A and B are shown apart, each in its own frame.
Chain A
Amino acid sequence: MFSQILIIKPGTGISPNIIISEDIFPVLHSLFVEHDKKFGITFPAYSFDKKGHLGNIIEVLSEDKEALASLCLEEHLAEVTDYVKVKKEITFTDDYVLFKRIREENQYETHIKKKNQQIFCAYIKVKSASTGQSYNIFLAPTDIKHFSAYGLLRG
Chain B
Amino acid sequence: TLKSRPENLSFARCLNTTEAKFWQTDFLKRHTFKLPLLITDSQSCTLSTECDTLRIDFGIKVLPVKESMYSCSDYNYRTAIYQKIDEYIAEDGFLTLAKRYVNNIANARFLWRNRKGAEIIETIVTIEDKEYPSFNSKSFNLDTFVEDNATINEIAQQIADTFAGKREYLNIYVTCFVKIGCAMEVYPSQEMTFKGKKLFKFEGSAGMHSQKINNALRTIDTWYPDYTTYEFPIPVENYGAARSIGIPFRPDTKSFYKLIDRMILKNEDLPIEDKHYVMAILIRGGMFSKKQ
CA–CA, A63 and B242, complex, Å: 39
Instruction: Please tell me if the beta carbons of B142 and A82 are within 8 angstroms of each other in the complex.
Output: yes
Q: Is residue B141 contacting chain A, with contact meaning CB distance below 8 A?
A: yes
Q: List B contacts of A11 (CB < 8 A).
A: 142-143, 219, 232-234, 242, 244
In the complex, chain A residues whose CB is within 8 Å of the CB of B113: 13-14, 18
Whether, in the assembled complex, B13 has its beta carbon less than 8 Å from a beta carbon of chain A, the answer is no
Judge whether A10 is part of the interface by a CB distance below 8 angstroms: yes
Q: What is the bound-complex CA distance between A12 and B232, given in angstroms?
A: 9
The complex places the Cα of A147 from the Cα of B142 at a distance, in Å, of 36
A38 contacts chain B at the CB level, 8 A cutoff: no
Q: Is B195 part of the binding interface, using a Cβ–Cβ cutoff of 8 Å?
A: no
Interface residue total, chain B, C-beta cutoff 8 A: 18
Q: Are the CB atoms of A10 and B244 closer together than 8 Å?
A: yes
Contact residues of A: prevailing secondary structure: loop
| Chain A residues whose C-beta falls within 8 Å of the C-beta of B234 in the assembled complex | 11
The B-contacting residues of A in range 1-21, CB under 8 angstroms, are 9-14, 18-19
How big is chain A's contact interface, by range? 10 to 19
Give B201-240 interface residues, CB cut-off 8 Å to A: 216, 219, 230, 232-234
Q: B109 near A: Cβ within 8 Å?
A: yes
A residues in contact with B230, CB < 8 Å: 10
CB distance from B146 to the nearest CB of A (A): 14
Answer yes or no: B116 CB below 8 A from chain A CBs: yes
Q: What's the least CB distance linking A132 to chain B, in Å?
A: 16
Q: Is the CB of A83 within 8 A of B232?
A: no
Nearest Cβ on chain A to B209's Cβ, whole angstroms: 15
Interface centre among A80, A82, A83 (most CB of B within 10 A): A82
The answer to whether A12 and B142 have CB atoms under 8 Å apart is yes
Bound complex: CA A80 to CA B112 (Å): 15
Interface centre among A9, A13, A22, by most chain B C-beta atoms within 10 angstroms, is A13
What residues of chain B have their CB less than 8 Å away from a CB belonging to chain A?
Answer: 109, 112-113, 115-117, 141-143, 216, 219, 230, 232-234, 242, 244-245
